């Protein structure tokens, strides 16, 4: 016959941070009840209060870039186009969504949660014996 048999780089790549759906992530944190590793107040606030506290995402992103330094042992620099773009966007969304350290653009957005759940979603239950097997 004929086919390709090539490295599925895109399939061996990850999309979990793409499909993360933060409100129900927050819920599953509440349910799975492990304590949170939150920081103290001075570790929170940004720049003599000129900006907000920080977002929880921004805490995560700082922790990860600090990990890039932790292992990789090098920093970023003042590269013009990219960080100007990202810094502007993140600060604009800071001044338009986050209030006191938590964000509400998550509700002003338009990404649904049924496109994540989808009544079991992937490898879904579409036959009655599949219903029987999942119920047992």
């Amino acid at each position: 016959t004929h086919f390709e048999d090539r490295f599925d780089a895109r399939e061996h790549k990850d999309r979990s941070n793409k499909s993360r759906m933060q409100a129900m992530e927050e819920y599953i944190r509440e349910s799975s009840d492990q304590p949170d590793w939150s920081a103290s107040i001075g570790a929170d606030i940004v720049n003599h209060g000129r900006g907000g506290i920080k977002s929880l995402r921004d805490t995560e992103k700082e922790r990860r870039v600090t990990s890039f330094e932790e292992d990789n042992f090098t920093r970023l620099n003042i590269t013009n186009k990219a960080e100007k773009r990202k810094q502007k966007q993140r600060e604009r969304n800071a001044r338009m969504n986050v209030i006191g350290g938590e964000d509400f653009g998550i509700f002003s957005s338009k990404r649904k949660l049924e496109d994540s759940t989808s009544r079991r979603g992937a490898k879904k239950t579409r036959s009655a014996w599949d219903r029987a097997q999942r119920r047992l």
Binding site: H48, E69, F73, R75
Partner: protein, 97 residues
């Protein structure tokens, strides 16, 4: 009075080139950004080392004071220190011309 604190965080080691690796925070309340030369000597006694072989660099100070972000090394031989350092750092330490 002043808790002369540079936390040499991100602590790792490399004995191929024989040098030790560590990041910098600077916690130093009521002090104005301690300088790398007295840091060099202070690192020299704490690591029982050479005044050239100590090598830290690139310090940025955090808000709220008594906190600075930098990026530091130490060699473990005089030959390694005198050959493997780039010359801009050699003149920052005043060892080259």
């Amino acid at each position: 009075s002043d808790a002369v604190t540079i936390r040499t965080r991100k602590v790792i080691s490399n004995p191929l080139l024989a040098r030790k690796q560590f990041v910098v925070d600077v916690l130093h309340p009521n002090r104005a950004n301690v300088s790398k030369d007295e840091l060099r000597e202070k690192l020299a006694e704490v690591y029982k080392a050479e005044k050239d072989a100590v090598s830290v660099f690139g310090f940025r100070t955090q808000f709220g004071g008594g906190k600075s972000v930098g990026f530091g090394l130490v060699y473990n031989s005089v030959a390694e220190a005198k050959k493997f350092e780039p010359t801009y750092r050699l003149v920052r330490y005043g060892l080259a011309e």
